[PDB]
Specification:
This is part of a larger assembly, with eight protein chains of eight kinds. With 43 residues, chain C is an all-alpha fold. Chain C has one helix spanning 27-42. Chain C has one helix and no strands. Chain D has 385 residues and is mainly alpha-helical. Chain D has a single domain, classed as Cytochrome-c3 Hydrogenase, chain B (Orthogonal Bundle). In chain D, 48% of the residues lie in helices and 10% in strands. Chain D has helices at residues 42-47, 55-61, 66-81, 87-116, 120-139, 162-184, 190-194, 202-207, 213-217, 224-227, 248-271, 290-293, 297-308, 351-360, 366-374, 380-384; strands at residues 2-3, 18-24, 27-34, 149-150, 153-154, 319-323, 328-334, 343-347. The longest helix of chain D has 30 residues, at 87-116. Chain G is mainly alpha-helical and 315 residues long. In chain G, 63% of the residues lie in helices and 0% in strands. Chain G has eleven helices and no strands. The radius of gyration of chain G is 20 Å and the shape is globular. Chain H has one domain (1-339). Chain H is 36% helix and 10% strand. Chain H is built from eleven helices and ten strands. Chain H has helices at residues 26-38, 75-83, 103-121, 141-156, 175-180, 204-215, 235-246, 257-269, 278-284, 307-316, 321-324; strands at 18-20, 42-46, 65-69, 87-90, 125-129, 161-163, 168-169, 188-189, 202-203, 252-253. Chain H is globular. The structure holds Ubiquinone-9, 1,2-diacyl-SN-glycero-3-phosphocholine (2 copies), 1,2-Distearoyl-sn-glycerophosphoethanolamine (2 copies), NADPH dihydro-nicotinamide-adenine-dinucleotide phosphate (NDP) and iron/sulfur cluster (SF4) (2 copies). One iron/sulfur cluster is lined by residues 79-85, 96, 127-128, 130, 132-133 of chain A. The PDB classes it as electron transport. The entry lists the keywords Respiratory complex, Respiratory supercomplex, electron transport. Respiratory complex Peripheral Arm of CI, close form A, focus-refined map of type I, Wild type mouse under thermoneutral temperature. Chain A is NADH dehydrogenase [ubiquinone] iron-sulfur protein 8, mitochondrial. The organism of A is Mus musculus.
């Protein structure tokens, strides 16, 4: 099904009345005045902006935001170094090397997410079997120096501890969907 | 209070406030991060409110937001525009493509970061760094500009 | 069971066609206004 | 014709375009656009990545139409596997496919005006855009660059409540398009700077491979969505907005009309989206549900192999083209039996359109060039790839 | 499992024979994928002739060039596989004509047949190095102005050999041999087990 | 003098600004069309001159001659314009 | 005293000049669904002063140039614009000039140079062209601008702006001569390079500010906005005549205040509402659409007096 | 130590952790450049606000350049800077005795405390930089004071290399820009009409490369190298040559120094970085000493670079649009004076 836009169905022959109406349109800029009315109208509408520090634009539970590594309630970090979070990262951001901890458990000696390399796809959130690496809600982590953006296990684990309460609520809300 | 030190602390506080309140952003509009700021310029998160003007020519520009990948063909230009900006000048690197290479880090045509090309003041993280996130980064530039004490250093120099 | 779906009976109808209103004073009448101003103004 | 090297002056933007030009005073004699200021390697990088980890590249190829691009790779990978997405996923993709078209047109029409000099339409519609992004975020997690449309369907069902809001918005957006209109469609001045600028003949448009509104604006009737239906765009009913006297103004009117027609398609999708699953049930292609991978051995094995290694698409090659908002977006994906692709030339509606800048802007003023770059919706990501 | 209509695999198949018959001097192989897509294969010399017949034949009008690309099979003597995908708005069908070109054996240019190819042919030269005779203006499009090497060739390193940084001493951007701070981790992904006879 | 006083303050205010502004911080573009316009401009600018005394000339006792003269001037220049339009001039 | 009367009539205008940018960055805002600048100071009142201090502190790059034009030009733009407020007859003028409107027309004409000088002074061939656009349009629009005034004067009787207060004691000159008001308003929009007619600073870089940053940028800048007011104020004396009572002179200035602000608000409203015209589209209007209208209506204003026996009283 | 791995460019390792206290300087900028290029760990003590040291960030790689807040009067700041460095390079110097820092401080007092701590730390080597021809009796307080230092630091730090550069030629240098900037002055005073003060400039990079090479070579210990240059010059040709490339008239008019030392005193009174210095003036007319000494350039591995070769880049900013395109070939060379 098609539709002609800007196709004049027929040649309306000028009638004085028509001509006057048109000539008035050119002479007294009638349509231009129409446009001014629209903007005056909004001037009276409530502005949609938010006080950025005081009010925040709404983000729902799946917002990917900033990486964090979670821990079990007991206090044992969730990651067991299966290293498929490294395998599926599209940007090669996550670097993981592991060795059996003294307890005998499997754990990662080094877990480094290069956030400048990361493109926040959220697949790592997807891939983890124990769901140790999660996309945390915080988006405000702008840093003065490039090195700060590179994150080792201690920053991510600390990021995990700080935001665990909200991360748990967010995962709680969206897990049925996944 | 009465001390040549107090007068020189208050007056930079004045000079810093002027630069902080009116930052005109020059936006190298590479890739897509430029859109995530066109959203900052837009009504939900106005930037003008904060004194940041929508768009100013390079010559008139206090900050340079580098949004998007800096390829090896645009690098020679960014430096030119950074070099031609007026002296008081600051750079905000937006996007994992610009602060670091991001997806496309290992490409043969992408500079792995704009920090290699232009000195960078605030690095805003995120593939499309959210628009509040840029606004937080611009506000962090304002916190960095408040702390600067140029007059104090000249007095005790 | 519970999945996000259209409400029973379907949603209501949404307008897509242009609704620009052809609202204005007729041209002859318009001319008269300005002309009258001049005619009077001159007198 | 003193070369001015205009475009590194951020004058029409849409990316970074060095439009070296030779201008006898204010008349353009020849335009030789330069490209690659945003080449990043997207085509070579994909060869070194698995099918699912190359999906995020497609969102970045032309990111104003974030998802519609993802659908083209999806379709392509589904064809190679001879798998099809489940019924609900198809409707979703058409739902977010259209929402994305609006997003692109709001970008193209309002950014066109900002270069022309009208600035209030951009702020009016960027607020509506914003509201749409929020749909993306509440469905994918990201405002833009979602990664929601994956090769076997959508990633996760819509949140419980989105459809209702994609209604409230749709119920009103029209008036917003109407307003822009009262400001530009008939402005005594928009018409002038746009009418009879960059007229492209019908035969020439097909010859230079324009394939988009640019063809439709010249009166050629071709919407790959009606001619070669993809997903369930066949089950909906919409009217292609064909144009006559093709010129910047006519095509514009066409883009405002598809914004209108997409609201007609969105309405339907909300009215008729089926109950069902949003991803193929073949754990072979689609990753297993997390409850299943945490309780069933075959599901863990399928989760581990899918994320670590990949789909393992059967050897073959396909060119699948959809109707991305800009025009025909196609992926020629040659594939060996391996889990990572062999080639993935992205046909960008835009590589062809820019080329036409020369044959469109002839004997035109500096301001005309600015208007024509706008009427091609050039996103340098797709052109540079 | 995708729905497949054999109406197309029959229509397209027949057309293939029709093209082949009409252009037997160049058509080497004409196949229809299981995905209902035709792919006439032509000797490189048949570039001009086969395209022109498809652009201007009443029973096969293929007016627009969707794409021109060149896969690179390094094993294949003729490294590149120029592939031209065409669309027929009249018959709502697409066909692909693919030829083979080695590095220093140029292909003819079709800018005459379709001017769409003016840019894509420059793109193929820049990335793969195939040369197109009779091209109006062949010159690098996507790569940097001084780039050495053709990037999409399978034998070109992803990271490449040169990267750019600003040097104060010389106050100008300067290439240096690439030094990467985390090399691309080359995960081996192929499994040692096949899937089906194919 | 009163004007002189005002004007020198006016220059002083501007020179003050530029001075502080510089002290506080411590080839062939030619189109006959453009030349042609400048010319037309003066032909019109001169006419503006021959038309400027009209406020004093209104009070002239003649009146008939005044208008007869003024109408002829405006008409002959406008015809100049007319030929400018007719010719490629004014068509940039 | 006279000196005090120079502070007033200058500072007050400069302070008001600063508050126009603010009322521009908020009225454009609310029209575009955004608050505009309210965070610095209260409701953005300190916002104009803030950017002024940033601009002066930044390096006057002085980018390579002809130096004494990079400095003289900005000064001419501010000097002429602030100077043209010297004779405005807000109630009583400051320096009453018998040939006042010729002073305003002549002083405006001189500003076209600043554009020409700044464009030549930068060494960017681009700028050389950008200045050409403004310089050409300025003189062009000047030709209809002048003729429109000559029509007015002939119905006022003199060149002195003070006479119109006595001419408009019964009716605004808009009623009569409205057809020219519109044409004076559009020409006032061109001569202040405001939006509908703002090709300068257009696609060139969205011309004679290209190389101008910090203090030089500011001075023209200030000039433009003061002009924006002055020309609007001339509309509010010549065509919209504020009520004058000899017993209380300030209701004249009170209404002059109200009409000037509204017409100043109008060009702010015009800017947001309209796309910018093409370079030739702009000259096509003046030489084709307006100049024939103005020249003919000019003759009608030499005839209206005579045969309606209304020749205006000199003095 | 740090075994040197890599190919040689950025993102590689050379194993030189080096505190460099006066890096912000014209010479400094260059020292950090090579050290960063080589891949060395560079600690840059700074006192000026961060805004001014940004120019040093892009040099060197991530985590290769570390900036520390430091005050000369506060001994503790120097202490922590050299805590983990194994090479200390001292470029602290000024031409104008500032209100709160005297030539002694900038040259002898401070540069002592620094090396003193460096020893306490156990830094393998310290490189101290003092001006060329620096007698303990030289006229300019500056030169003499510098001489005083090179002695002292030897007692605080024995076997501490002491490179002694001549006035340096480089973009952003004074030697070349100062003269070129005499344009503002209608006449360009030249003591003895610019004669009998033969001068041998040395490119900044040569100096930098030399300095860097010192850091990575065992041959230099207690060595007092003298980077000099590839050709000497009577101040006359130098001045004119400069004006030559700048394409600005050259009007050599002799000025009795006794009066000129007074002119230096004048600008010297300037609060904001006096442009000329009484101590400068003397230095400028202080004849370059002869080259009989532990050789510097070449000896340390870099062949000096003639002035004319790169002069075009240093003096270009001073030309006018008319001469911008002009090139070195068009212009003439100056003449050397083996004297
Ligand atoms: C066109 O888009 C725009 C820009 O981009 C070019 C702008 O930069 C700007 C600039 C931003 C502004 C808020 C305006 C700048 C205004 C000024 C420089 C005002 C200066 C004011 C003063 C000097 C104060 C008055 C002076 C005195 C009392 C001193 C008397 C002795 C605007 C307004 C804008 O909208
Ligand atoms: C209170 C604020 C009032 C604001 C009014 C303008 C904005 C609202 C417009 C609403 C609208 O859409 O209608 C426009 C309407 C819309 O009409 P239209 O363009 O849709 O078509 C109607 C006209 N015909 C049918 C003949 C084509 O425009 C008009 O009615 C004509 C306006 C003519 C304006 C002529 C120029 C302005 C007047 C110049 C003379 C001086 C007048 C006084 C100046 C000030 C003196 C103090
Ligand atoms: C008053 C008398 C009439 C003055 C104007 C007519 C005579 C002009 C003679 C110019 C001689 C050359 C000259 O001044 O060179 C400097 C300039 C040209 O060179 P420049 O000064 O631009 O060169 C800059 C060089 N650097 C960057 C190193 C500083 O002359 C000009 O053309 C500009 C104006 C000069 C001074 C005129 C003052 C007029 C004041 C009016 C109020
Ligand atoms: C006795 C008979 C008297 C007849 C009088 C007729 C009206 C008098 C004014 C007519 C002006 C000339 C004209 O007709 O319009 C010119 C132009 C529109 O021209 P256009 O339609 O493009 O036609 C081109 C044909 N070659 O007009 C324009 O495009 C102007 C450009 C737009 C600038 C902004 C326009 C809107 C301004 C809104 C506020 C206007 C306020 C005017 C009054 C202010 C207070 C004095
Ligand atoms: C900056 C350059 C532009 C300077 C601003 C523009 C000034 C324009 C002056 C135009 C002429 C003014 C005038 O004619 O008024 C004359 C005045 C009163 O005379 P009159 O109107 O006849 O009244 C007599 C009975 N009441 O009485 C007079 O006689 C005034 C005499 C002239 C006053 C001029 C004031 C100084 C302006 C020149 C400054 C020169 C320095 C700058 C040079 C710039 C060069 C580019
Ligand atoms: N022509 C030349 O340049 C020659 C130089 N030399 C020697 O080489 C050295 C480097 O010269 P150059 O780079 O030109 O010198 P600069 O004038 O560039 O300053 C060098 C560094 O010293 C720092 N500095 C100066 N005074 C103090 C102080 N009181 N406290 C702390 N830091 C201070 C400065 O830091 P900040 O600016 O932050 O205060 C600056 O970064 C000098 O010491 C000089 O004696 C020798 C011969 C010729
Ligand atoms: S996947 Fe989850 S668990 Fe396995 S390694 Fe990555 S993070 Fe640790
Ligand atoms: S960072 Fe993510 S979003 Fe910003 S440009 Fe690179 S890819 Fe596009």
């Amino acid at each position: 099904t098609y539709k002609y836009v800007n196709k004049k169905e027929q040649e309306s022959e000028v009638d004085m009345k028509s001509a006057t109406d048109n000539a008035a349109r050119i002479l007294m800029w009638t349509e231009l005045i129409r446009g001014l009315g629209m903007t005056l109208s909004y001037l009276f509408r409530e502005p949609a902006t938010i006080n950025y520090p005081f009010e925040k634009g709404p983000l729902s539970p799946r917002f990917r935001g900033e990486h964090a590594l979670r821990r079990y309630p007991s206090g044992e970090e969730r990651c067991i170094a299966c290293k498929l979070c490294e395998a599926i990262c599209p940007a090669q951001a996550i670097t993981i090397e592991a060795e059996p901890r003294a307890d005998g458990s499997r754990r990662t000696t080094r877990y480094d997410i290069d956030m400048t390399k990361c493109i926040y796809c959220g697949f790592c959130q997807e891939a983890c079997p124990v769901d140790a690496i999660v996309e945390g809600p915080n988006f405000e982590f702008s840093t003065e120096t490039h090195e700060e953006l590179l994150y080792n296990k201690e920053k991510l684990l600390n990021n995990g501890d700080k935001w665990e309460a909200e991360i748990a609520a967010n995962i709680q809300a969206d897990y049925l969907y996944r | 209070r009465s001390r040549a030190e107090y007068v020189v602390t208050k007056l930079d506080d004045l000079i810093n406030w002027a630069r902080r309140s009116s930052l005109w952003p020059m936006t190298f509009g590479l890739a897509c991060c430029a859109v995530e700021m066109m959203h900052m310029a837009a009504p939900r998160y106005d930037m003008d409110r904060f004194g940041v003007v929508f768009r100013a020519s390079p010559r008139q520009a206090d900050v340079m937001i580098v949004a998007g990948t800096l390829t090896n063909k645009m690098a020679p230009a960014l430096r030119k525009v950074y070099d031609q900006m007026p002296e008081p000048r600051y750079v905000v690197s937006m996007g994992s493509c610009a602060n670091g290479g991001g997806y496309y880090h290992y490409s043969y045509s992408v500079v792995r970061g704009c920090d290699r090309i232009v000195p960078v003041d605030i690095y805003v993280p995120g593939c499309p760094p959210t628009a509040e996130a840029l606004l937080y980064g611009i506000l962090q530039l304002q916190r960095k500009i408040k702390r600067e004490q140029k007059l104090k250093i000249w007095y005790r120099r | 069971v519970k999945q996000d779906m259209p409400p029973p009976g379907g949603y209501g109808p949404i307008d897509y066609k242009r609704n620009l209103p052809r609202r204005g004073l007729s041209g002859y009448s318009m001319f008269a206004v300005g002309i009258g101003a001049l005619i009077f103004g001159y007198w | 014709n003193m070369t001015l090297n205009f475009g590194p002056q951020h004058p029409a933007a849409h990316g970074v375009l060095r439009l070296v030009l030779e201008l006898s005073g204010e008349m353009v004699r020849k335009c030789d656009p330069h490209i690659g200021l945003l080449h990043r390697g997207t085509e070579k990088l994909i060869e070194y990545k698995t099918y699912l980890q190359a999906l995020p590249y497609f969102d970045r190829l032309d990111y104003v139409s974030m998802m519609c691009n993802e659908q083209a790779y999806s379709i392509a990978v589904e064809k190679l596997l001879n798998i099809q997405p489940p019924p609900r996923a198809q409707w979703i993709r058409v739902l977010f496919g259209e929402i994305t078209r609006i997003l692109n047109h709001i970008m193209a029409v309002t950014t066109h005006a900002l270069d022309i000099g009208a600035m209030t339409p951009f702020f009016w519609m960027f607020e509506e855009r914003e509201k749409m992004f929020e749909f993306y975020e509440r469905v994918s997690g990201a405002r833009m660059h979602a990664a929601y449309i994956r090769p076997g369907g959508v990633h996760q069902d819509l949140p419980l409540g989105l459809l209702d809001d994609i209604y409230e918005f749709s119920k009103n957006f029209s008036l917003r398009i109407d307003e822009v209109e009262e400001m530009l469609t008939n402005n005594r001045i928009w018409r002038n700077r746009t009418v009879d600028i960059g007229v492209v003949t019908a035969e020439d448009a097909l010859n230079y491979g324009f394939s988009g509104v640019m063809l439709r604006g010249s009166g050629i009737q071709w919407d790959l969505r009606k001619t070669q239906p993809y997903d369930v765009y066949d089950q909906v009913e919409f009217d292609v907005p064909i144009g006559s006297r093709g010129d910047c103004y006519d095509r514009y009117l066409c883009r405002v009309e598809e914004m209108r027609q997409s609201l007609r398609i969105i309405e339907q999708c909300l009215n008729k989206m089926p109950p069902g699953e949003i991803k193929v049930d073949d754990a072979k292609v689609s990753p297993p549900k997390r409850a299943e991978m945490k309780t069933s051995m075959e599901s863990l094995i399928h989760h581990f192999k899918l994320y670590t290694e990949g789909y393992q698409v059967p050897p073959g090659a396909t060119y699948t083209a959809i109707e991305a908002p800009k025009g025909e977006f196609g992926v020629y994906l040659v594939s060996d039996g391996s889990s990572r692709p062999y080639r993935c030339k992205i046909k960008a509606p835009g590589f062809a359109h820019l080329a036409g800048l020369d044959k469109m802007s002839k004997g035109h003023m500096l301001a005309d060039v600015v208007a024509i770059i706008g009427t091609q919706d050039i996103v340098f990501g797709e052109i540079d790839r | 499992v995708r729905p497949r209509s054999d109406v197309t695999h029959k229509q397209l198949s027949a057309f293939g024979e029709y093209v082949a018959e009409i252009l037997p001097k160049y058509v080497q192989q004409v196949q229809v994928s299981c995905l209902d897509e035709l792919e006439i294969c032509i000797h490189p010399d048949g570039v001009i002739p086969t395209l022109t017949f498809l652009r201007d034949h009443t029973n096969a009008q293929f007016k627009s060039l969707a794409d021109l690309t060149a896969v690179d099979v390094p094993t294949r003597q003729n490294r590149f596989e120029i592939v031209y995908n065409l669309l027929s708005l009249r018959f709502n069908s697409r066909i692909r004509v693919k030829t083979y070109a080695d590095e220093l054996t140029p292909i003819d240019s079709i800018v005459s047949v379709h001017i769409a190819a003016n840019w894509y042919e420059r793109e193929v030269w820049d990335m793969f190095g195939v040369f197109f005779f009779n091209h109006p203006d062949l010159r690098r499009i996507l790569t940097d102005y001084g780039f050495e090497g053709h990037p999409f060739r399978k034998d070109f390193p992803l990271t490449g050999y040169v990267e750019l940084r600003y040097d104060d001493e010389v106050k100008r951007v300067v290439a240096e041999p690439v030094e990467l701070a985390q090399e691309f981790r080359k995960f081996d992904l192929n499994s040692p087990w096949e899937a089906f006879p194919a | 003098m009163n004007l002189y006083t005002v004007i020198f303050i006016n220059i002083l205010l501007s020179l003050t600004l530029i001075l502080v502004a510089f002290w506080l911080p411590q080839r062939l573009p030619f189109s006959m069309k453009f030349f042609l316009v400048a010319i037309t401009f003066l032909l019109f600018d001169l006419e503006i001159a021959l038309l400027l005394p009209l406020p004093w000339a209104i009070q002239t006792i003649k009146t008939s001659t005044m208008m007869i003269m003024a109408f002829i001037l405006v008409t002959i220049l406008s015809l100049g314009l007319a030929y400018e339009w007719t010719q490629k001039g004014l068509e940039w | 005293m006279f000196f005090i009367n120079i502070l007033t009539l200058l500072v007050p205008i400069l302070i008001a000049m600063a508050f126009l940018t603010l009322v521009e960055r908020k009225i454009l805002g609310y029209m575009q669904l955004r608050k505009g600048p309210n965070i610095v100071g209260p409701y953005g009142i300190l916002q104009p002063f803030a950017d002024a201090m940033k601009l002066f502190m930044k390096e006057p790059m002085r980018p390579t140039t002809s130096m004494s034009l990079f400095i003289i030009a900005p000064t001419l733009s501010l000097t002429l614009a602030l100077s043209l407020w010297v004779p405005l007859p807000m109630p009583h003028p400051l320096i009453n000039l018998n040939l006042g409107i010729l002073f305003i027309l002549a002083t405006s004409s001189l500003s076209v140079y600043s554009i020409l000088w700044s464009g030549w002074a930068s060494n960017s061939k681009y700028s050389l062209f950008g200045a050409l656009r403004a310089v050409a349009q300025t003189i062009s629009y000047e030709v209809t601008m002048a003729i429109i005034l000559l029509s007015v004067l002939l119905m006022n009787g003199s060149y002195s702006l003070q006479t119109l207060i006595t001419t408009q004691e019964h009716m605004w000159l808009l009623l009569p001569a409205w057809p020219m008001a519109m044409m004076w308003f559009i020409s006032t929009l061109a001569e202040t390079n405001r939006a509908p007619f703002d090709l300068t600073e257009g696609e060139s870089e969205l011309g004679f500010n290209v190389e101008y940053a910090a203090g030089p940028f500011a001075l023209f800048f200030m000039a433009e906005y003061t002009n924006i007011i002055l020309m609007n104020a001339l509309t509010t004396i010549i065509f919209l005549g504020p009520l004058y009572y000899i017993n209380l002179p300030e209701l004249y200035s009170t209404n002059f205040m109200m009409e000037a602000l509204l017409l100043s608000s109008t060009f702010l409203w015009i800017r947001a509402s309209y796309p910018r015209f093409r370079y030739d589209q702009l000259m096509h209007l003046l030489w084709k659409n307006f100049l024939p209208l103005t020249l003919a209506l000019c003759m009608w204003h030499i005839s209206l007096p005579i045969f309606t026996a209304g020749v205006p009283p000199y003095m | 130590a740090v075994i040197p791995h890599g190919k040689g460019g950025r993102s590689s390792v050379s194993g030189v952790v080096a505190t460099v206290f006066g890096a912000t300087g014209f010479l400094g900028r260059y020292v950090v450049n090579h050290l960063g290029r080589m891949g060395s760990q560079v600690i840059i003590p700074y006192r000026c606000d961060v805004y001014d040291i940004m120019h040093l960030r892009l040099m060197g790689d991530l985590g290769q350049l570390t900036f520390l807040e430091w005050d000369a009067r506060d001994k503790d700041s120097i202490r922590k800077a050299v805590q983990h460095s194994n090479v200390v390079i001292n470029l602290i110097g000024r031409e104008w005795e500032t209100r709160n820092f005297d030539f002694e401080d900038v040259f002898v007092n401070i540069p002592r405390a620094i090396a003193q701590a460096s020893k306490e730390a156990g830094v393998e080597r310290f490189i101290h930089v003092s001006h060329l021809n620096a007698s303990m009796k030289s006229s300019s307080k500056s030169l003499r004071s510098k001489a005083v230092g090179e002695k002292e630091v030897r007692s605080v730090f024995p076997e501490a290399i002491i490179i002694r550069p001549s006035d340096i030629f480089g973009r952003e240098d004074r030697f070349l820009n100062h003269f070129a900037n005499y344009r503002w002055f209608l006449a360009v005073p030249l003591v003895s009409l610019g004669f009998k003060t033969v001068k041998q400039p040395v490119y900044v990079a040569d100096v930098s490369k030399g300095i860097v090479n010192a850091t990575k070579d065992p041959d230099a210990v207690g060595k007092t190298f003298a980077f000099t240059g590839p050709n000497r010059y009577l101040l006359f040709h130098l001045v004119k040559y400069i004006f030559g490339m700048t394409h600005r008239t050259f009007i050599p008019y002799p000025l009795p120094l006794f009066v000129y030392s007074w002119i230096g005193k004048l600008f010297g009174l300037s609060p904001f970085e006096p442009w000329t210095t009484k101590d400068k003036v003397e230095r400028i007319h202080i004849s370059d000493v002869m080259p009989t000494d532990l050789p510097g350039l070449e000896d340390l591995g870099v062949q000096p670079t003639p002035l004319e070769l790169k002069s075009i880049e240093v003096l270009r900013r001073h030309r006018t649009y008319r001469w911008l395109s002009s090139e070195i070939e068009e212009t003439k060379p100056a003449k050397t004076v083996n004297y």
